[PDB]
Design a protein around this ligand. Structure first.
Ligand SMILES: C#Cc1cccc(Nc2nc3cc(C(=O)O)ccc3c3cncnc23)c1
Length: 327
């Protein structure tokens, strides 16, 4: 079968935590008072919930309320336990309360409110400095959650809320996050298409924190090159082909061969042969001010087929790309 894999860092975090920490199915939710919060306006809904701006009438503060759809009850305590485990961590959104909504008959998560500028608008204006600065803030959040034995699995621009005024960043929507246990096989149906790691795309289930680092690399490439999303596939198969047109097919084969993985035969007549490209090819007069040798080398070290070969969050923070960011 497949060759097994282990995270190269934080491998045994959960192994030596108490069972209460990671056994989320045993978690007992501490309920707050649903009457404390008044819905103000609907912000949107995903496949799993509806999110509302609201006011906390005990202090008149703005908050956000995420009313979970009655689907996949297991996921509910997973997301709750992960938020409580990570609460107070750098740049991790704060879960302020949990209440039972009387209409949906489901849990409603109450989060801190972030006065953000949507990425579709924000990304048009980021400077070279802004991108390094915010990348560094994202890494703080990822090193934190990885060091706490959790992978996010849904890193994408929408989940990185940024108040550009106060230069405040929060990593949100831990609804796809999971505990990392060495040797555990996970569902590959996670992340948004454009940010799915090659591991998910070739059906390799024994992945780990390094998945987030691929997603981060996709974000970075979209920011420095001003092309969002960068790998813009039409479906999960074309997504891998798009990647292979940049990283090349030989290193893809090396990857699947290392883990003795077999490509879906559907790729037989769509994958072709492709050389690995140099990142400079994506540079032009409209994004060159965002690009530097340090940026390209950092990106290159994030976007690797082999999950074991990508920079960890901690290593990424040590990269020359961030020397110019004020600490
Ligand atoms: C569905 C939807 C939808 C569509 C557009 C905008 C938003 N806005 C916000 N979503 C959040 C989600 C979470 C979470 O899921 O952990 C935490 C905090 C926020 C948040 C905080 N502050 C301001 N806005 C949001 C949501």
């Amino acid at each position: 079968g497949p060759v097994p894999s282990r995270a190269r860092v934080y491998t045994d975090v959960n192994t030596h935590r108490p069972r209460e920490y990671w056994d989320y199915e045993s978690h007992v939710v501490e309920w707050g008072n649903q009457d404390d919060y008044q819905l103000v306006r609907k912000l949107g809904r995903g496949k799993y919930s509806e999110v509302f701006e609201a006011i906390n009438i005990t202090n008149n503060e703005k908050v956000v309320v995420k009313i979970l759809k009655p689907v996949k009850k297991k996921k509910i305590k997973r997301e709750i336990k992960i938020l409580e485990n990570l609460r107070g961590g750098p740049n991790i959104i704060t879960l302020a309360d949990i209440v039972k909504d009387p209409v949906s008959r489901t849990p409603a998560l109450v989060f801190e409110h972030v006065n953000n500028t949507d990425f579709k608008q924000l990304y048009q204006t980021l400077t070279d400095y802004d991108i390094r600065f915010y990348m560094y803030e994202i890494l703080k959040a990822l090193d934190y959650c990885h060091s706490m034995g959790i992978m996010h699995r849904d890193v994408k621009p929408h989940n990185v809320m940024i108040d550009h005024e106060h230069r405040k960043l929060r990593l949100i929507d831990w609804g796809l996050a999971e505990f990392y246990h060495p040797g555990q096989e996970y569902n590959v149906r996670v992340a948004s298409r454009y940010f799915k790691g090659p591991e998910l795309l070739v059906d390799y289930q024994m992945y780990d924190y390094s998945l987030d680092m691929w997603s981060l690399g996709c974000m970075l490439a979209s920011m420095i090159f001003r092309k969002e999303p960068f790998f813009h596939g039409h479906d999960n198969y074309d997504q891998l082909v798009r990647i292979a047109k940049v990283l090349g097919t030989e290193d893809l084969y090396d990857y699947i061969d290392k883990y003795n993985i077999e490509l879906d035969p559907r790729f037989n007549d769509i994958l072709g042969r492709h050389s690995r490209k140099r990142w400079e090819r994506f540079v032009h007069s409209e994004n060159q001010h965002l690009v530097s040798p340090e940026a390209l080398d950092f990106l290159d070290k994030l976007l690797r087929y082999d999950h074991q070969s990508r920079l960890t969050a901690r290593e990424a923070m040590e990269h020359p790309y961030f020397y110019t960011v004020v600490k």
